[PDB]
């Protein structure tokens, strides 16, 4: 199932993911926080999953939120580095899904991250072409949930 | 405390961490699996914590172990990237400690990773000076458990 979703990651898709990551991943703290705060803004209900982070309205200034945001970017860094080897990408994606499955985060719930990522990409001038590429990467993770 | 331990990362310690990581971090899959296999070999008692991984003796052939090993290296990548800012290093370490605290991994238990790291370092011509540098970094995490 995860292997099938990984099959959608064509040569052109991987190319756009890498080029866009070269910029997005250059500032993990800045963009990581941008993704989370945007998620909470467009889908307030997702905050129910982050009670441990405390006052998320503080954004960057919130140490726990900042810690989470930075760490989130290293999961994406991981995925991006394994793109050329489906076997490694799959094992890393399934490993990643373990904790999210335990948190009872469905594929649909996880997909709510697509909007934030699309917006962050647009702030760096990466159009729909790139947003679609990232939606496909997220789809690989969704297949594991 | 974690804040006092982070202050132990002096200038030369950070430098040695970077220089050694430049090599060790070049092959996250290979070195990551070596670290885990060494841990299970020198400290068989820790295998109980990894029941989900299955037959750990399969090494690289075990998809779950390989996935975990690769992911582990990205946590270290995270720490290394935060060496410039103590505030970020701390929030990232505390974030990382959450799941390990939940698994009831004590500071003493976590410290068993020092042996494996030292051996992997040695296999790449990096001696005691570097093993001690990494022990200090591991100490920051121990302070958070
Ligand atoms: C591409 C998007 C995402 C990435 C790369 C990502 C990455 C991570 C990482 C690396 C962790 C730390 C390791 C762990 O405990 O699993 C984590 C924790 C977590 N994730 Fe995800 N995640 C993503 C999306 C989501 C979404 C959409 C939700 C929920 C709506 C979610 C909820 C959580 C929660 C609740 C935690 C624990 C936070 C804490 O208490 O510190 N994640 N995620
Ligand atoms: C350099 C030290 C270590 C690093 C960088 C590291 C890194 C990680 C990472 C990134 C994860 C995935 C996220 C999470 O679930 O928290 C993880 C999972 C885990 N770690 Fe640690 N860890 C280290 C040492 C240890 C040690 C010494 C133990 C046990 C004595 C331990 C036990 C666990 C367990 C049981 C899991 C879950 C594995 C699974 O079921 O997939 N870790 N660790």
Largest interface comes to: A-B, 26 and 26 residues
Q: How many alpha or pi helices of chain A?
A: 8
Q: What is the H/E order of chain A?
A: HHHHHHHH
- Taken as a percent bin, the fraction of beta residues of chain A is under 5%
Oligomer: homodimer
What is the fold named in CATH at topology level of chain A?
A: Globin-like
CATH architectural arrangement of chain A: Orthogonal Bundle
Bound molecules: protoporphyrin IX containing FE
Structural class of chain A, please? mainly alpha
β-strand number of chain A? 0
Count of separate structural domains of chain A: 1
* Rg result of chain A: 15 Å
* CATH classification, class level of chain A: Mainly Alpha
Percentage of residues in helical conformation of chain A? 55-70%
- The N- and C-terminal alpha carbons of chain A lie at a distance of 10 Å
Largest sheet of chain A: none
Shape assignment of chain A:
globular
According to CATH, the homologous superfamily of chain A is: Globins
Protein name (chains A, B): Globin-1
Pfam families (chains A, B): Globin
GO molecular function (chains A, B): heme binding; identical protein binding; metal ion binding; oxygen binding; oxygen carrier activity
Binding site for heme b (chains A, B): 100
């Amino acid at each position: 199932s995860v292997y099938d979703a990984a099959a959608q990651l064509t040569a052109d898709v991987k190319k756009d993911l890498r080029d866009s990551w070269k910029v997005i991943g250059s500032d993990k703290k800045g963009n990581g926080v941008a993704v989370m705060t945007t998620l909470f803004a467009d889908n307030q209900e997702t905050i129910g999953y982050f009670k441990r982070l405390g006052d998320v309205s503080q954004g960057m200034a919130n140490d726990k939120l900042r810690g989470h945001s930075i760490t989130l970017m290293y999961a994406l860094q991981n995925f991006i580095d394994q793109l050329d080897n489906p076997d490694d990408l799959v094992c890393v994606v399934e490993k990643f899904a373990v904790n999210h499955i335990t948190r009872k985060i469905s594929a649909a719930e996880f997909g709510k991250i697509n909007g934030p990522i699309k917006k962050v990409l647009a702030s760096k001038n990466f159009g729909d072409k790139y947003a679609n590429a990232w939606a496909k990467l997220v789809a690989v993770v969704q297949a594991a949930l």
